[PDB]
Design a protein around this ligand. Structure first.
Ligand SMILES: *[C@@H]1O[C@H](CO)[C@@H](O)[C@H](O)[C@H]1NC(C)=O
Ligand SMILES: *[C@@H]1O[C@H](CO)[C@@H](O)[C@H](O)[C@H]1NC(C)=O
Ligand SMILES: *[C@@H]1O[C@H](CO)[C@@H](O)[C@H](O)[C@H]1NC(C)=O
Lengths: 28, 50, 49
């Protein structure tokens, strides 16, 4: 749950999974 | 000589044809096949979910 | 270019990577113009001008 300093994103493993899972759509 | 020839006919119809990056005509869907094609035709994607 | 009888490049809705129909045809990219709005940051008339 706490952030892992190893990853440069400075986010926890659970936060990283949620960031990865959530993804014309963005090119107008 | 030995040969053969085919004959067909054309009638009005409304379809949605698909093209790839090069522009080659890839898919040609038929709306008179079944409503199940119309499912993805209206849903505007080619992968359906439960 | 990809094929002769069709050359007007366009991918999603409006990019239209072509121009209209040149004799040399062929398509490179799109850059007509692209710029956005503006806003003003103020601290307060009775504070500064
Ligand atoms: C259309 O795609 C490429 C164009 O980048 C071309 O080399 C290829 O021969 C064409 N056909 C297919 C099936 O890719
Ligand atoms: C003129 O047409 C020829 C096509 O044969 C081609 O070189 C080009 O599209 C045009 N412009 C010049 C400078 O040749
Ligand atoms: C602006 O600030 C001064 C002093 O802080 C105050 O007297 C005044 O009421 C404020 N408003 C205006 C419109 O001057």
């Amino acid at each position: 749950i706490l952030p892992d300093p190893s990853k440069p994103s400075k986010r926890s493993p659970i936060e990283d999974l949620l960031f990865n899972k959530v993804t014309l759509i963005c090119a107008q | 000589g030995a040969a053969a020839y085919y004959v067909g006919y054309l009638q009005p119809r409304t379809f949605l044809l698909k093209y790839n990056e090069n522009g080659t005509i890839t898919d040609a869907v038929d709306c008179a096949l079944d409503p199940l094609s119309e499912t993805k035709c209206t849903l505007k994607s080619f992968t359906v979910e439960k | 270019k990809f094929l002769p009888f069709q050359q007007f490049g366009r991918d999603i809705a409006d990019t239209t990577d072509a121009v209209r129909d040149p004799q040399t045809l062929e398509i490179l990219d799109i850059t007509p113009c692209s710029f956005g709005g503006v806003s003003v940051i103020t601290p307060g008339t009775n504070t500064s001008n």
